[PDB]
Design a protein around this ligand. Sequence first.
Ligand SMILES: Cc1cn([C@H]2C[C@H](OP(=O)(O)O)[C@@H](COP(=O)(O)O)O2)c(=O)[nH]c1=O
Ligand SMILES: [Ca+2]
Length: 129
Amino acid sequence: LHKEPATLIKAIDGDTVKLMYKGQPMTFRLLLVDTPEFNEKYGPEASAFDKKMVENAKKIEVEFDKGQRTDKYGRGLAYIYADGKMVNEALERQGLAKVAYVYKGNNTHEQLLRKAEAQAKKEKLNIWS
Ligand SMILES: Cc1cn([C@H]2C[C@H](OP(=O)(O)O)[C@@H](COP(=O)(O)O)O2)c(=O)[nH]c1=O
Ligand SMILES: [Ca+2]
């Protein structure tokens, strides 16, 4: 997999973010994770966490997996990095998302994320508290 540049347009919620990619505005949906909706428990904390990560970053990158790059809603599907740190993994490690939506062919970082979730679970963080 390869990292490609993008710039933040705006935070949306725990697992979606508006980025300019190849000069076009797009909503990105983070691969392999599920954050609570804003209206659900830990939703606001997940939204805030993703926001801080992407707003504080000097450099946002997107990394598509090997499979589909857009979902049925036109959202880009990617791993998103903030100064080289993966947002998807960071949410997992903090107990602010669950590994989910693991579809064959777009699951390169599955075990990395499951490992983070396990440590969050062990630590009883947030969703696992
Ligand atoms: C993460 C992800 C979600 N989706 C779709 C499946 C779900 O369809 P349904 O809307 O029919 O449930 C939806 C979940 O996204 P959200 O969690 O953002 O709602 O997005 C993909 O198709 N591929 C993906 O990789
Ligand atoms: Ca969600």
